[PDB]
Symmetry: D2
Subunit: 333 residues, 4 copies
């Protein structure tokens, strides 16, 4: 039997501090999307959250770097609770929190909210993919940035969802490399929509959104990678032709690394060189990072991904130092 | 704004014994085609979108006569699409904006969609639609004999979840650039059990556990290039078999297979007819965008003329159906 | 499965005319409760509604008398949908509309609302006993006056309900004759309350009422009748002592007639004589009247009560003429 | 915004032990109602719960006596959360838990449920008056016996409620002494009913109850006390005439003590003498008892009532010893 959002909000109401951090980070990201600030948004952290203890530890380490590089980078943790699978498989902490096929969704929603509240309380803003239609009412108040995934960017129900979110949103190119669907999606999500959604009390209702003015695209590769200067330039052209923001984000992982976590640093190096040359159209980067590198089928090892493989903490330190130094030069130019 | 729950609509428009029987029977018949147990050709045919119930009922009456006439060769089911996925923005269909004026009277739209579907089934004409929205199906799905998941949503996990709990057979379209694998993947996904959030007949969110949908198949609807010919059908059947799913598929004559030109649908149908006459063992169905009047219009001025994708008119519809019936009659007679 | 009030409001929205009639009649009745007009409120009609056809016919006849006597009497029809039984039995049209133990409550609510909308549209305002806690959301917008019954006047949940109704409300003395519980009830219902109630969407909620300033008592007999001058005078004294309105209503039926419908006219005569001597504390009277007199266990005869016995239409004409003539004299003096 | 029962059941699910205690105690009480066991049910404790700490302390003391007298008495604590007032006033812990007019009903429901869970977990079954229509879904699973108050026994909505409760229920005579309304109420509540109620998910619904076969009357005084042998005998006769159980309960407080807490022991003495002569029609007694005697308008003193005045702990020990000794003799016959 499904508890409504108000039951979770009652137990875990947003704090003054978390509320402030969310508000501020959304504004800061909006400034990047619209070219008002030349800091680099960095969406970085696990492919998926499957353990809160490891997540909190990761966050504590990330926070020290968030502060250290705050003049160059705007660091925000990946806190992904919903995973789109190719066919079937574990869909994330919300859907199956005990990792055993019990689908204890009430527990999963409580735990997702609790983790997000602790993260924001310690000073670390959070990001997630918004995949499911009804779950956002449980946690979206704690989210500073949202993704719509490659598999759902062309979906009208996701563009509707995005049009009503209060955080900035990045739309990914399609899994085969189609960018136009993401440009289209900004067009769609920036407008007003009417559609059915569920209230905080757990009731279906008609909602009328105002449109989301803070949307941008994400280059995450296709049949070929799309992270280099030539692809970025092509994309900026099309963005301008559609009359939407020509500031974009580049995912170092997924199809840009060819699913090989060791190649994320390669992509980051290319981005660093672009930032040093010019890189005027880059407002952000995405990175799949955990305490420990690689991946595992069963959750045996602490801080090691059970979905896409990630770089470990050591490489994370290097990647962030690399991007901070490069962007410091861009910002000084 | 104040959304009525499905039970309010079910109270005013409860399913009849006859409509319930027609739906049950047609779903079974279509399942038999999906699994190669019958060699009749499923034909999903009708308007791109429903925007007028009067014209829809008139179209249905004409179609019914041909449904009966060709019932040994073709299993004809009307396109009764209430939900339209747009490229960017635009009219999303009768449910979202029934008065066609930007008033978004969704309660009226749901009532009217249900009423039309009940009348169609009561006159003997089964209905099909694209299932796009997550919450609307509880209002009408009991009256639907076949569902589409669109090219733009086939790769979407929430649509595969939805499909996994529907009681009707479901066709998954290849992606707008031509990717077939996402539709094969989608059958894999939708045929399994899922747990997810959905809304009850009382209008309350709830956890649902579906049993998986065993009646799913792919639809070839074109990409950067058309994919309707024998070479593409054969390639697709191979992949289907490699994934261990049904290698019987449907071919859309419209959208990217006609290159968005309604006058080319007949071309595609002719190619399918020739395939059915040579062999065509992997074809179980075809889709066609048809209305009383051909073409399209921005405003709903002309009666029975599409306000979304352009359609063939009634005359060409008669020819197209006769062409497919004759061709499939030969297939069904062949040893 | 229970439809929420919004489903019924969607099918049967209140009209401009019915809205106006309700608003006006509530104001008019308030004027009587607070001694600003000396017309006599007359709550008259069947013990219970069991047939809408007969109800509409009765209403059409009553309307003619409502117009005729409008300078002396303010006539409002008894349209009672909810009946409190001594032990068990038929609870009214809402609970069991088909009169067969099928309890088709959705149909009953729809039919109760439809009838009330037609009555108001033809110019006849309606009254009912408010017995059930959740049903009022379905029809209260069409009610000009409400009763809380003898069996429920001492009940805190009914006093809460009354405190939030937008129509004037009469509280009946207890079945053994206790008047204090009704005086207490005005005290209670005139104040603000917080309690649980159900919304128009069918969801439980906390409500905060403002108190009902239009409440008054009804004398309906006990072990003995309480309709005479001596009892009216005693009651007015106690009313003043409790600092509440000393204008009251007298029921000609139930324990004041000793459950004998032929004695209602006796009571009405006594009231008429009071109105002619003085009768300053009387603002209303209640009468159980139908097309045909008496009662019946099965609904075999048209327009004949299946609950308490009623006077027939001929005696109804006489009773109303008697009260109109008596009050015309009161008003002139 | 009102949380639904499932939110509270999620945080405070019933335990194996509490569930067992509730189940056993209901059965044991049923056996007393139907004359299958001659132990005396004793409903004893505060007029109202306003403090959980004091309530838990009281319960710990009462538990020791519950064990000590378990062969003679079946002791169950008064854990009343809902109070019917004469006009206006504090309605109990649920309605206004902070005792300040803030009406924090969500907090009140949570706290009521938490207290009941702790009481049952320590071995002490609980009783309450069921006054409100929607609150029972939050706690009734933890209640071993329920009262319908003197002010609501004649109310059809309370008789409906009772008909669907899973615990035995006592109906009180009316505030002026009318017993027939309580006999009528057993008749009503023992039958099946259809009516509107709210589900564990907080939605209104139609419910079909099976009737409550475990109902009985409670003599709690009227204009005069009704606790003596004469009154008990008169009541048993009427009970038998109505074909319902002629085993009844006697309230030592309220109108039987003439609202004087010191007189409760007097009433208990009379009952003891009855149990020693014969007393075959007595199955229970009710007593208003707290840690400290008397009452207070403000909650200044610990363990002292803020509603009706109670006897203190010392007199409680004497009263219970008196009833145990008397009933031990009855049981031995
Ligand atoms: C879901 C995946 O992103 P994408 O949509 O680019 O495949 C991820 O970030 O883990
Ligand atoms: C929505 C469209 O289908 P497709 O998903 O192939 O674009 C249609 O049937 O009008
Ligand atoms: C229920 C009855 O009134 P009372 O509450 O005085 O018995 C009636 O009006 O039919
Ligand atoms: C409410 C009161 O009992 P009664 O209903 O007899 O007044 C009590 O037990 O506190
Ligand atoms: Mn990933
Ligand atoms: Mn189309
Ligand atoms: Mn009556
Ligand atoms: Mn008390």
């Amino acid at each position: 039997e499904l508890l409504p959002p108000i039951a979770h909000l009652y137990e875990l109401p947003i704090s003054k501090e978390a509320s402030g951090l969310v508000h501020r980070t959304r504004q800061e990201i909006s400034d990047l999307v619209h070219g008002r600030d030349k800091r680099l948004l960095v969406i970085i952290g696990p492919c998926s959250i499957h353990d809160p203890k490891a997540a909190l530890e990761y966050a504590e380490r990330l926070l020290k770097l968030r502060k250290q590089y705050e003049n160059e980078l705007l660091i925000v943790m990946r806190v992904y609770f919903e995973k789109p699978r190719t066919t079937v498989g574990w869909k994330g902490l919300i859907n199956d929190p005990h990792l055993d096929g019990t689908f204890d969704i009430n527990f999963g929603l409580r735990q997702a909210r609790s983790l997000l509240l602790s993260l924001n309380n310690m000073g670390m803003p959070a990001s997630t993919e918004f995949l499911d239609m009804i779950t956002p009412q449980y946690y979206a108040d704690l989210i500073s940035w949202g993704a719509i995934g490659a598999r759902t960017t062309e979906s009208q129900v996701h563009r509707e969802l995005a049009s009503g979110l209060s955080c900035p949103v990045g739309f990914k190119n399609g899994t085969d490399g189609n960018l136009k669907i993401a440009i289209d999606a900004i067009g769609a999500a920036s407008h007003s929509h009417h559609f059915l959604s569920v209230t905080k009390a757990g009731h279906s209702a008609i909602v009328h959104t105002g449109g989301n003015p803070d949307c941008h695209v994400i280059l995450r590769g296709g049949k070929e990678p799309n992270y280099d200067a030539e692809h970025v330039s092509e994309a900026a052209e099309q963005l301008r032709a559609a009359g939407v923001t020509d500031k974009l984000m580049i995912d170092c992982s997924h199809a840009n690394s060819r699913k090989d976590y060791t190649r994320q640093m390669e992509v980051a190096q290319d981005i660093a060189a672009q930032l040093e040359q010019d890189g005027g159209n880059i407002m952000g980067v995405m990175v799949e990072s955990h305490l420990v590198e690689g991946r595992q089928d069963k959750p045996e090892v602490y801080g090691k991904s059970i979905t896409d493989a990630c770089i470990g903490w050591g490489a994370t330190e290097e990647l962030l130092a690399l991007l901070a130094g490069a962007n410091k030069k861009r910002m000084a130019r």
